[PDB]
Write a structure and sequence with these properties.
By secondary structure, the protein is of the alpha+beta class. Helix content is 29%, strand content 39%. A hairpin with a 2-residue loop joins strand 6 (113-121) and strand 7. The chain is globular, with a radius of gyration of 15 Å. It comes from [Eubacterium] siraeum DSM 15702.
Length: 135
């Protein structure tokens, strides 16, 4: 593809939500969570979907969010970020969504991918829905 890797992958996560596909959204989760925390995480994704009122009429990519890199002898061994979209539903309601994304983790390849999703209305993080686990 012809965009940043972070944006390409993030756009496909937003498409899972537009379509309400928890199989596909969950297949982005890290290995340790698919092996260990499947029933918890799929049920938390359902809530995420019940928190979105109506079909998504539009979305737009805000940045990478923040995160960390580490590089050793020229080679990246750790890279975290938080891909973010604003989006709007058929009701008129604007949401903001942020996915926790451990893009590269060489010491721990089983932690690579999504671990956490966060969501709120009109950019109000004082009342957010936070799902997933911390790594």
């Amino acid at each position: 593809g012809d965009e940043g890797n972070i944006k390409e992958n993030a756009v496909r996560m937003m498409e899972c939500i537009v379509n309400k596909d928890s199989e596909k959204l969950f297949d982005f989760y890290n290995k340790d969570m698919k092996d260990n925390y499947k029933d918890s995480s799929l049920d938390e994704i359902r809530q995420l979907f019940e928190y979105i009122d109506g079909a998504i009429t539009s979305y737009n990519y805000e940045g990478k969010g923040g995160g960390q890199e580490a590089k050793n002898d020229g080679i990246i061994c750790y890279y975290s970020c938080h891909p973010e979209f604003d989006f709007t539903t058929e009701t008129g309601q604007e949401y903001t969504i942020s996915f926790s994304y451990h893009y590269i983790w060489n010491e721990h390849p089983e932690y690579e991918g999504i671990n956490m999703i966060q969501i709120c209305k009109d950019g109000n993080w004082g009342e957010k829905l936070i799902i997933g686990r911390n790594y």
